[PDB]
Design an enzyme around this catalytic site. Structure first.
Site, short mmCIF file in Angstrom:
data_model
loop_
_atom_site.label_atom_id
_atom_site.label_comp_id
_atom_site.label_asym_id
_atom_site.label_seq_id
_atom_site.Cartn_x
_atom_site.Cartn_y
_atom_site.Cartn_z
CG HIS A 48 -25.42 4.13 -91.20
ND1 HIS A 48 -25.99 5.37 -91.05
CD2 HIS A 48 -24.23 4.15 -90.53
CE1 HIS A 48 -25.15 6.13 -90.34
NE2 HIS A 48 -24.07 5.43 -89.99
CG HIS A 63 -25.75 4.72 -85.85
ND1 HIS A 63 -25.19 5.30 -84.71
CD2 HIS A 63 -25.45 5.54 -86.90
CE1 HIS A 63 -24.46 6.35 -85.11
NE2 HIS A 63 -24.63 6.52 -86.43
CG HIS A 71 -24.58 6.08 -79.98
ND1 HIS A 71 -24.30 5.39 -81.16
CD2 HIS A 71 -23.39 6.34 -79.38
CE1 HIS A 71 -22.96 5.28 -81.27
NE2 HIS A 71 -22.41 5.87 -80.20
CG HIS A 80 -28.52 3.26 -82.59
ND1 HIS A 80 -27.72 4.27 -82.03
CD2 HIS A 80 -29.75 3.82 -82.77
CE1 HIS A 80 -28.58 5.18 -81.53
NE2 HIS A 80 -29.79 4.97 -82.05
CG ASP A 83 -24.48 2.39 -82.56
OD1 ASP A 83 -24.57 2.13 -81.35
OD2 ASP A 83 -25.34 3.04 -83.19
CG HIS A 120 -19.56 7.93 -89.10
ND1 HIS A 120 -20.75 8.48 -89.52
CD2 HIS A 120 -19.74 6.59 -88.93
CE1 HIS A 120 -21.64 7.48 -89.57
NE2 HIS A 120 -21.06 6.31 -89.26
NE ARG A 143 -24.55 7.41 -94.28
CZ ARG A 143 -25.09 6.40 -95.00
NH1 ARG A 143 -24.49 5.22 -95.03
NH2 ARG A 143 -26.22 6.58 -95.69
ZN ZN Z 1 -25.67 4.81 -82.58
#
Ligand code: ZN
Length: 153
Positions: A48, A63, A71, A80, A83, A120, A143
């Site tokens: 992030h 992200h 995603h 992203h 990620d 996560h 998170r």
């Molecule tokens: Zn993502």
């Protein structure tokens, strides 16, 4: 060459170190990290935004969404541009943060250096669309541990 560290702690009962190194700038980063204290099983592993917040998380949502990325896991075509996907933790909550992406870098600008890595709650979606928050960000779940990356030579 020259390593970044992300000591990941955040707030959940987790503790770990990412060691980011690569030969070049414009080349594939060799991510190795030895995170522990997770719950068992799969855990989304996402970077992030959250630069100069305080030290760790304070602040970030997606992200690192620049405008409207979708995603995708490692296996996906898309993702992203913050990620990688997920890891799996054993039982001492020990994960194996071994990844080798070819899009990101640890140089600057589009590199993820500076950003807040996050481990996560659940698995990430991988880009199947289990729901929708799936494609929008990745539906990692909450998170746990996090930290700004870059804190070595
Ligand atoms: Zn993502």
């Amino acid at each position: 060459a020259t390593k970044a560290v992300a000591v990941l702690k955040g707030d959940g009962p987790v503790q770990g170190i990412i060691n980011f190194e690569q030969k070049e700038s414009n080349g594939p980063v060799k991510v190795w990290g030895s995170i522990k204290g997770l719950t068992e099983g799969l855990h989304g592993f996402h970077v992030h935004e959250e630069e100069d917040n305080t030290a760790g998380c304070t602040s970030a949502g997606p992200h690192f969404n620049p405008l409207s990325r979708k995603h995708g896991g490692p296996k996906d075509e898309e993702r992203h541009v913050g990620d990688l996907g997920n890891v799996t933790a054993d039982k001492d909550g020990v994960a194996d943060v071994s990844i080798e992406d070819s899009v990101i870098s640890l140089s600057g600008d589009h590199s993820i250096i500076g950003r807040t890595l996050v481990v996560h709650e659940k698995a990430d979606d991988l880009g199947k669309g289990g729901n929708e928050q799936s494609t929008k960000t990745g539906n990692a779940g909450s998170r746990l541990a996090c930290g700004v990356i870059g804190i070595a030579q």
